[PDB]
Amino acid sequence: SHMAEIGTGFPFDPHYVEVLGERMHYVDVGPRDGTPVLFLHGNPTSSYVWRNIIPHVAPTHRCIAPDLIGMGKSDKPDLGYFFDDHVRFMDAFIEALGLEEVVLVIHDWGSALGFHWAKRNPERIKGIAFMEFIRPIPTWDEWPEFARETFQAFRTTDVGRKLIIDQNVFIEGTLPMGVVRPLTEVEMDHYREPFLNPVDREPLWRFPNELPIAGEPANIVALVEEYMDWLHQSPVPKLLFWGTPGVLIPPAEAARLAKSLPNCKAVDIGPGLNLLQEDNPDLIGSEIARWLSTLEISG
Amino acid sequence: AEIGTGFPFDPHYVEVLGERMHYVDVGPRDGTPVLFLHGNPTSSYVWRNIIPHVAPTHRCIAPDLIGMGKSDKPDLGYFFDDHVRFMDAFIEALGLEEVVLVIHDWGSALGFHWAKRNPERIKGIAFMEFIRPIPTWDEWPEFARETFQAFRTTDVGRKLIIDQNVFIEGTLPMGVVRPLTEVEMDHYREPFLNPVDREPLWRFPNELPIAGEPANIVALVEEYMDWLHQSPVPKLLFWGTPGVLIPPAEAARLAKSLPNCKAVDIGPGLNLLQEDNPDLIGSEIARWLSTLEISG
Ligand code: NA
Ligand code: NA
Ligand code: NA
Ligand code: NA
Ligand code: NA
Ligand code: NA
């Protein structure tokens, strides 16, 4: 059988909340008397990446999907856009909406935010669904060969900024490199929208420079090790989506994690790179919905 | 004795996370270095009359925090997180192993937070007018309460600190008992002639742990104060009357409660104690260093 056509629209009412003096944009749909499901995107995406996942979940659960500070339709203060900046703003976003307990659905740098938050707020986490997530990559050989020269250049002084900031390579090159199917022009224009001006591309370059690869930056490596240790020892319900060949999470790693993470169901989406949501949204959405029905939530 | 206004130190610069940081670096390379950390709105200039008491016998390193002094001015928010990251990297870029700290104001938060995380490397801490949690506004001096509330008031605080440069033109001299001279003022004004460069001056008072906010800073500061209370590291506390961040009663109580701590009364003092009695501070640091178990 064949997949349904993948929607290009973003049929959600926009919201903004003031966070530390800046406005962050977010989606907020579904019923509000239960446990919210908080969807966190990564680099170089926005809440747009969840547009075809949310409709599977919204009939039964609240869906909140923010745009990270400096990204999407959120404000763009003059920050370095280190992980520290994202942590601060995301923590404050969650408090600004008065969220208590949540289910997380997280991806890429959004997964570092989600796992780091959950480790610090273990009483408030009712489940985590995750995919293509940030983990330590101890050698460049564990980074995919098709992306090695590129990410090394991204992290090389002067060259990386020329590619990402001046030439917009993370949007024009790396984003398509992360989707097995071809993105349409309408989809590309949605992803391009926040970054038309090169000055606004700082987060796109800082993010690959924060990835924990070959021990650097050491502070990120430590933080990520800490939340991975937490995840390995946590009874929290877990749902892991993976694809072939993946980028951050190759199939062999997914298979290891299906055993070494407690209470974890792993689901193969088929072909996939980084943005698994773009390659099989209906499997990811339908499986999240089924998994939510099994959790200690509905209030 | 007359207090020197000059800054007779050759520039040193080091690349840190892709940005350049300026620092004073004098004295011999064959011992344990003494790392001097300034706060808001100062620079290594604040240590200019203290360093010469120490440099004959110990290397003195005095960086300008990122965004301040002669250090580069990247487009950051200048949150404490930014200062932590850059200072950690500065220390590693100089290849420092064990150190003695001499710290003040926001420099004290940096130093104590670093020491907590590097307990085997810290061999002594001299400190003054330091950051601790302030649970209510009542515990902030009245001559400055309305001002700091305004600094932390949306839009108003930026008008004062960024547009009008009040932290330099007002708060700085407010923090010295004696009158700062025009030459000294001009040294302190140097990094902030352009209003956009005043961001760190505004973010700092907005990071102060007062009445529980920002909660992340409150937690961090509580953690390093607990660490300090539990550490056998040699400690030297300078204080003055009436103080600003530290009233005399609190200073004297800490001298008793902290392990291995000597307190030194500098006389009249507000925040920038270094400007009111540099010769006592410098000479006492020198004497104290000679008593430590450092190498050599
Ligand atoms: Na639409
Ligand atoms: Na590092
Ligand atoms: Na020198
Ligand atoms: Na005054
Ligand atoms: Na004065
Ligand atoms: Na807070």
JSON list of N, CA, C and O in Angstrom, two decimals, chain A residues 87-125:
[
{"chain": "A", "resi": 87, "resn": "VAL", "atom": "N", "xyz": [17.89, 26.39, 26.53]},
{"chain": "A", "resi": 87, "resn": "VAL", "atom": "CA", "xyz": [17.42, 25.84, 27.79]},
{"chain": "A", "resi": 87, "resn": "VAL", "atom": "C", "xyz": [16.65, 26.90, 28.58]},
{"chain": "A", "resi": 87, "resn": "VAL", "atom": "O", "xyz": [15.55, 26.66, 29.07]},
{"chain": "A", "resi": 88, "resn": "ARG", "atom": "N", "xyz": [17.25, 28.09, 28.71]},
{"chain": "A", "resi": 88, "resn": "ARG", "atom": "CA", "xyz": [16.66, 29.15, 29.49]},
{"chain": "A", "resi": 88, "resn": "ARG", "atom": "C", "xyz": [15.29, 29.54, 28.94]},
{"chain": "A", "resi": 88, "resn": "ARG", "atom": "O", "xyz": [14.31, 29.64, 29.67]},
{"chain": "A", "resi": 89, "resn": "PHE", "atom": "N", "xyz": [15.21, 29.73, 27.63]},
{"chain": "A", "resi": 89, "resn": "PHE", "atom": "CA", "xyz": [13.95, 30.16, 27.04]},
{"chain": "A", "resi": 89, "resn": "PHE", "atom": "C", "xyz": [12.90, 29.06, 27.05]},
{"chain": "A", "resi": 89, "resn": "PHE", "atom": "O", "xyz": [11.73, 29.33, 27.29]},
{"chain": "A", "resi": 90, "resn": "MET", "atom": "N", "xyz": [13.31, 27.82, 26.80]},
{"chain": "A", "resi": 90, "resn": "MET", "atom": "CA", "xyz": [12.35, 26.73, 26.84]},
{"chain": "A", "resi": 90, "resn": "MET", "atom": "C", "xyz": [11.81, 26.46, 28.25]},
{"chain": "A", "resi": 90, "resn": "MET", "atom": "O", "xyz": [10.61, 26.23, 28.44]},
{"chain": "A", "resi": 91, "resn": "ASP", "atom": "N", "xyz": [12.67, 26.51, 29.26]},
{"chain": "A", "resi": 91, "resn": "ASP", "atom": "CA", "xyz": [12.22, 26.37, 30.63]},
{"chain": "A", "resi": 91, "resn": "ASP", "atom": "C", "xyz": [11.17, 27.44, 30.92]},
{"chain": "A", "resi": 91, "resn": "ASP", "atom": "O", "xyz": [10.12, 27.18, 31.52]},
{"chain": "A", "resi": 92, "resn": "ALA", "atom": "N", "xyz": [11.47, 28.67, 30.49]},
{"chain": "A", "resi": 92, "resn": "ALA", "atom": "CA", "xyz": [10.56, 29.77, 30.76]},
{"chain": "A", "resi": 92, "resn": "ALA", "atom": "C", "xyz": [9.26, 29.73, 29.94]},
{"chain": "A", "resi": 92, "resn": "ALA", "atom": "O", "xyz": [8.23, 30.15, 30.43]},
{"chain": "A", "resi": 93, "resn": "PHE", "atom": "N", "xyz": [9.32, 29.17, 28.73]},
{"chain": "A", "resi": 93, "resn": "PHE", "atom": "CA", "xyz": [8.13, 28.93, 27.94]},
{"chain": "A", "resi": 93, "resn": "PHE", "atom": "C", "xyz": [7.16, 28.00, 28.68]},
{"chain": "A", "resi": 93, "resn": "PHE", "atom": "O", "xyz": [5.97, 28.25, 28.79]},
{"chain": "A", "resi": 94, "resn": "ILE", "atom": "N", "xyz": [7.70, 26.88, 29.16]},
{"chain": "A", "resi": 94, "resn": "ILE", "atom": "CA", "xyz": [6.90, 25.89, 29.87]},
{"chain": "A", "resi": 94, "resn": "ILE", "atom": "C", "xyz": [6.24, 26.50, 31.11]},
{"chain": "A", "resi": 94, "resn": "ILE", "atom": "O", "xyz": [5.06, 26.27, 31.36]},
{"chain": "A", "resi": 95, "resn": "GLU", "atom": "N", "xyz": [6.99, 27.30, 31.87]},
{"chain": "A", "resi": 95, "resn": "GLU", "atom": "CA", "xyz": [6.40, 27.96, 33.02]},
{"chain": "A", "resi": 95, "resn": "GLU", "atom": "C", "xyz": [5.40, 29.03, 32.63]},
{"chain": "A", "resi": 95, "resn": "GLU", "atom": "O", "xyz": [4.41, 29.23, 33.33]},
{"chain": "A", "resi": 96, "resn": "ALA", "atom": "N", "xyz": [5.66, 29.74, 31.54]},
{"chain": "A", "resi": 96, "resn": "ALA", "atom": "CA", "xyz": [4.75, 30.82, 31.13]},
{"chain": "A", "resi": 96, "resn": "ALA", "atom": "C", "xyz": [3.37, 30.30, 30.75]},
{"chain": "A", "resi": 96, "resn": "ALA", "atom": "O", "xyz": [2.38, 31.03, 30.88]},
{"chain": "A", "resi": 97, "resn": "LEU", "atom": "N", "xyz": [3.29, 29.06, 30.28]},
{"chain": "A", "resi": 97, "resn": "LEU", "atom": "CA", "xyz": [2.00, 28.43, 29.99]},
{"chain": "A", "resi": 97, "resn": "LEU", "atom": "C", "xyz": [1.42, 27.65, 31.18]},
{"chain": "A", "resi": 97, "resn": "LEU", "atom": "O", "xyz": [0.34, 27.08, 31.09]},
{"chain": "A", "resi": 98, "resn": "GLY", "atom": "N", "xyz": [2.15, 27.65, 32.29]},
{"chain": "A", "resi": 98, "resn": "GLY", "atom": "CA", "xyz": [1.66, 27.04, 33.51]},
{"chain": "A", "resi": 98, "resn": "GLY", "atom": "C", "xyz": [1.57, 25.53, 33.43]},
{"chain": "A", "resi": 98, "resn": "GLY", "atom": "O", "xyz": [0.75, 24.92, 34.10]},
{"chain": "A", "resi": 99, "resn": "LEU", "atom": "N", "xyz": [2.43, 24.92, 32.61]},
{"chain": "A", "resi": 99, "resn": "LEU", "atom": "CA", "xyz": [2.39, 23.48, 32.46]},
{"chain": "A", "resi": 99, "resn": "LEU", "atom": "C", "xyz": [2.92, 22.83, 33.72]},
{"chain": "A", "resi": 99, "resn": "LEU", "atom": "O", "xyz": [3.90, 23.31, 34.32]},
{"chain": "A", "resi": 100, "resn": "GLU", "atom": "N", "xyz": [2.28, 21.73, 34.09]},
{"chain": "A", "resi": 100, "resn": "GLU", "atom": "CA", "xyz": [2.63, 20.96, 35.27]},
{"chain": "A", "resi": 100, "resn": "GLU", "atom": "C", "xyz": [3.27, 19.66, 34.77]},
{"chain": "A", "resi": 100, "resn": "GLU", "atom": "O", "xyz": [4.48, 19.65, 34.50]},
{"chain": "A", "resi": 101, "resn": "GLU", "atom": "N", "xyz": [2.48, 18.60, 34.62]},
{"chain": "A", "resi": 101, "resn": "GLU", "atom": "CA", "xyz": [3.00, 17.37, 34.03]},
{"chain": "A", "resi": 101, "resn": "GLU", "atom": "C", "xyz": [2.79, 17.43, 32.53]},
{"chain": "A", "resi": 101, "resn": "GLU", "atom": "O", "xyz": [1.84, 18.04, 32.04]},
{"chain": "A", "resi": 102, "resn": "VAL", "atom": "N", "xyz": [3.69, 16.79, 31.78]},
{"chain": "A", "resi": 102, "resn": "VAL", "atom": "CA", "xyz": [3.60, 16.78, 30.33]},
{"chain": "A", "resi": 102, "resn": "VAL", "atom": "C", "xyz": [4.02, 15.43, 29.77]},
{"chain": "A", "resi": 102, "resn": "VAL", "atom": "O", "xyz": [4.67, 14.64, 30.46]},
{"chain": "A", "resi": 103, "resn": "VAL", "atom": "N", "xyz": [3.61, 15.17, 28.54]},
{"chain": "A", "resi": 103, "resn": "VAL", "atom": "CA", "xyz": [4.24, 14.17, 27.69]},
{"chain": "A", "resi": 103, "resn": "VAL", "atom": "C", "xyz": [5.10, 14.94, 26.68]},
{"chain": "A", "resi": 103, "resn": "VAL", "atom": "O", "xyz": [4.67, 15.94, 26.13]},
{"chain": "A", "resi": 104, "resn": "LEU", "atom": "N", "xyz": [6.31, 14.46, 26.45]},
{"chain": "A", "resi": 104, "resn": "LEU", "atom": "CA", "xyz": [7.20, 15.06, 25.46]},
{"chain": "A", "resi": 104, "resn": "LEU", "atom": "C", "xyz": [7.21, 14.27, 24.16]},
{"chain": "A", "resi": 104, "resn": "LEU", "atom": "O", "xyz": [7.22, 13.04, 24.18]},
{"chain": "A", "resi": 105, "resn": "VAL", "atom": "N", "xyz": [7.24, 15.00, 23.04]},
{"chain": "A", "resi": 105, "resn": "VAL", "atom": "CA", "xyz": [7.51, 14.45, 21.71]},
{"chain": "A", "resi": 105, "resn": "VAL", "atom": "C", "xyz": [8.62, 15.30, 21.14]},
{"chain": "A", "resi": 105, "resn": "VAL", "atom": "O", "xyz": [8.43, 16.48, 20.87]},
{"chain": "A", "resi": 106, "resn": "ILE", "atom": "N", "xyz": [9.81, 14.72, 20.96]},
{"chain": "A", "resi": 106, "resn": "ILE", "atom": "CA", "xyz": [11.02, 15.51, 20.75]},
{"chain": "A", "resi": 106, "resn": "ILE", "atom": "C", "xyz": [11.92, 14.94, 19.67]},
{"chain": "A", "resi": 106, "resn": "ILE", "atom": "O", "xyz": [11.94, 13.74, 19.40]},
{"chain": "A", "resi": 107, "resn": "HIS", "atom": "N", "xyz": [12.71, 15.82, 19.07]},
{"chain": "A", "resi": 107, "resn": "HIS", "atom": "CA", "xyz": [13.49, 15.51, 17.89]},
{"chain": "A", "resi": 107, "resn": "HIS", "atom": "C", "xyz": [14.74, 16.38, 17.86]},
{"chain": "A", "resi": 107, "resn": "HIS", "atom": "O", "xyz": [14.66, 17.58, 18.08]},
{"chain": "A", "resi": 108, "resn": "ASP", "atom": "N", "xyz": [15.89, 15.78, 17.53]},
{"chain": "A", "resi": 108, "resn": "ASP", "atom": "CA", "xyz": [17.10, 16.56, 17.20]},
{"chain": "A", "resi": 108, "resn": "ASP", "atom": "C", "xyz": [17.43, 17.48, 18.40]},
{"chain": "A", "resi": 108, "resn": "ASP", "atom": "O", "xyz": [17.37, 17.03, 19.55]},
{"chain": "A", "resi": 109, "resn": "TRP", "atom": "N", "xyz": [17.76, 18.75, 18.19]},
{"chain": "A", "resi": 109, "resn": "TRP", "atom": "CA", "xyz": [18.08, 19.59, 19.36]},
{"chain": "A", "resi": 109, "resn": "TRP", "atom": "C", "xyz": [16.90, 19.75, 20.32]},
{"chain": "A", "resi": 109, "resn": "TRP", "atom": "O", "xyz": [17.08, 19.98, 21.51]},
{"chain": "A", "resi": 110, "resn": "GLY", "atom": "N", "xyz": [15.67, 19.59, 19.83]},
{"chain": "A", "resi": 110, "resn": "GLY", "atom": "CA", "xyz": [14.52, 19.56, 20.71]},
{"chain": "A", "resi": 110, "resn": "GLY", "atom": "C", "xyz": [14.57, 18.39, 21.69]},
{"chain": "A", "resi": 110, "resn": "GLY", "atom": "O", "xyz": [14.04, 18.46, 22.83]},
{"chain": "A", "resi": 111, "resn": "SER", "atom": "N", "xyz": [15.21, 17.31, 21.29]},
{"chain": "A", "resi": 111, "resn": "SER", "atom": "CA", "xyz": [15.39, 16.17, 22.20]},
{"chain": "A", "resi": 111, "resn": "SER", "atom": "C", "xyz": [16.39, 16.48, 23.31]},
{"chain": "A", "resi": 111, "resn": "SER", "atom": "O", "xyz": [16.20, 16.03, 24.44]},
{"chain": "A", "resi": 112, "resn": "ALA", "atom": "N", "xyz": [17.46, 17.23, 23.02]},
{"chain": "A", "resi": 112, "resn": "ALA", "atom": "CA", "xyz": [18.37, 17.62, 24.08]},
{"chain": "A", "resi": 112, "resn": "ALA", "atom": "C", "xyz": [17.62, 18.50, 25.07]},
{"chain": "A", "resi": 112, "resn": "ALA", "atom": "O", "xyz": [17.73, 18.32, 26.29]},
{"chain": "A", "resi": 113, "resn": "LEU", "atom": "N", "xyz": [16.80, 19.42, 24.58]},
{"chain": "A", "resi": 113, "resn": "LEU", "atom": "CA", "xyz": [15.99, 20.24, 25.48]},
{"chain": "A", "resi": 113, "resn": "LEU", "atom": "C", "xyz": [15.04, 19.37, 26.31]},
{"chain": "A", "resi": 113, "resn": "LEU", "atom": "O", "xyz": [14.92, 19.52, 27.53]},
{"chain": "A", "resi": 114, "resn": "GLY", "atom": "N", "xyz": [14.35, 18.43, 25.66]},
{"chain": "A", "resi": 114, "resn": "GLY", "atom": "CA", "xyz": [13.36, 17.63, 26.34]},
{"chain": "A", "resi": 114, "resn": "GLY", "atom": "C", "xyz": [13.96, 16.71, 27.37]},
{"chain": "A", "resi": 114, "resn": "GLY", "atom": "O", "xyz": [13.47, 16.64, 28.49]},
{"chain": "A", "resi": 115, "resn": "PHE", "atom": "N", "xyz": [15.01, 15.99, 27.00]},
{"chain": "A", "resi": 115, "resn": "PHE", "atom": "CA", "xyz": [15.64, 15.08, 27.93]},
{"chain": "A", "resi": 115, "resn": "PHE", "atom": "C", "xyz": [16.29, 15.83, 29.10]},
{"chain": "A", "resi": 115, "resn": "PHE", "atom": "O", "xyz": [16.24, 15.36, 30.24]},
{"chain": "A", "resi": 116, "resn": "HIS", "atom": "N", "xyz": [16.90, 16.98, 28.82]},
{"chain": "A", "resi": 116, "resn": "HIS", "atom": "CA", "xyz": [17.54, 17.77, 29.89]},
{"chain": "A", "resi": 116, "resn": "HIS", "atom": "C", "xyz": [16.48, 18.30, 30.86]},
{"chain": "A", "resi": 116, "resn": "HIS", "atom": "O", "xyz": [16.67, 18.33, 32.07]},
{"chain": "A", "resi": 117, "resn": "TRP", "atom": "N", "xyz": [15.33, 18.70, 30.33]},
{"chain": "A", "resi": 117, "resn": "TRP", "atom": "CA", "xyz": [14.22, 19.14, 31.16]},
{"chain": "A", "resi": 117, "resn": "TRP", "atom": "C", "xyz": [13.64, 18.00, 32.00]},
{"chain": "A", "resi": 117, "resn": "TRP", "atom": "O", "xyz": [13.38, 18.15, 33.19]},
{"chain": "A", "resi": 118, "resn": "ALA", "atom": "N", "xyz": [13.48, 16.84, 31.38]},
{"chain": "A", "resi": 118, "resn": "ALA", "atom": "CA", "xyz": [12.89, 15.71, 32.07]},
{"chain": "A", "resi": 118, "resn": "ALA", "atom": "C", "xyz": [13.79, 15.26, 33.21]},
{"chain": "A", "resi": 118, "resn": "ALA", "atom": "O", "xyz": [13.31, 14.95, 34.29]},
{"chain": "A", "resi": 119, "resn": "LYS", "atom": "N", "xyz": [15.11, 15.20, 32.96]},
{"chain": "A", "resi": 119, "resn": "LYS", "atom": "CA", "xyz": [16.05, 14.82, 34.02]},
{"chain": "A", "resi": 119, "resn": "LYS", "atom": "C", "xyz": [15.93, 15.75, 35.23]},
{"chain": "A", "resi": 119, "resn": "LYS", "atom": "O", "xyz": [16.04, 15.32, 36.37]},
{"chain": "A", "resi": 120, "resn": "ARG", "atom": "N", "xyz": [15.71, 17.03, 34.97]},
{"chain": "A", "resi": 120, "resn": "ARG", "atom": "CA", "xyz": [15.61, 18.02, 36.04]},
{"chain": "A", "resi": 120, "resn": "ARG", "atom": "C", "xyz": [14.22, 18.10, 36.66]},
{"chain": "A", "resi": 120, "resn": "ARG", "atom": "O", "xyz": [14.03, 18.69, 37.73]},
{"chain": "A", "resi": 121, "resn": "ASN", "atom": "N", "xyz": [13.23, 17.52, 35.98]},
{"chain": "A", "resi": 121, "resn": "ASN", "atom": "CA", "xyz": [11.83, 17.57, 36.42]},
{"chain": "A", "resi": 121, "resn": "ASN", "atom": "C", "xyz": [11.20, 16.19, 36.31]},
{"chain": "A", "resi": 121, "resn": "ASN", "atom": "O", "xyz": [10.18, 16.00, 35.66]},
{"chain": "A", "resi": 122, "resn": "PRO", "atom": "N", "xyz": [11.80, 15.19, 36.97]},
{"chain": "A", "resi": 122, "resn": "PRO", "atom": "CA", "xyz": [11.36, 13.82, 36.70]},
{"chain": "A", "resi": 122, "resn": "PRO", "atom": "C", "xyz": [9.94, 13.52, 37.16]},
{"chain": "A", "resi": 122, "resn": "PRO", "atom": "O", "xyz": [9.32, 12.60, 36.64]},
{"chain": "A", "resi": 123, "resn": "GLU", "atom": "N", "xyz": [9.45, 14.29, 38.12]},
{"chain": "A", "resi": 123, "resn": "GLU", "atom": "CA", "xyz": [8.10, 14.13, 38.63]},
{"chain": "A", "resi": 123, "resn": "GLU", "atom": "C", "xyz": [7.03, 14.62, 37.64]},
{"chain": "A", "resi": 123, "resn": "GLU", "atom": "O", "xyz": [5.85, 14.26, 37.77]},
{"chain": "A", "resi": 124, "resn": "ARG", "atom": "N", "xyz": [7.45, 15.41, 36.66]},
{"chain": "A", "resi": 124, "resn": "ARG", "atom": "CA", "xyz": [6.53, 16.10, 35.75]},
{"chain": "A", "resi": 124, "resn": "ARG", "atom": "C", "xyz": [6.48, 15.45, 34.37]},
{"chain": "A", "resi": 124, "resn": "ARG", "atom": "O", "xyz": [5.82, 15.98, 33.47]},
{"chain": "A", "resi": 125, "resn": "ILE", "atom": "N", "xyz": [7.19, 14.35, 34.18]},
{"chain": "A", "resi": 125, "resn": "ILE", "atom": "CA", "xyz": [7.25, 13.71, 32.87]},
{"chain": "A", "resi": 125, "resn": "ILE", "atom": "C", "xyz": [6.48, 12.40, 32.87]},
{"chain": "A", "resi": 125, "resn": "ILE", "atom": "O", "xyz": [6.74, 11.51, 33.69]}
]
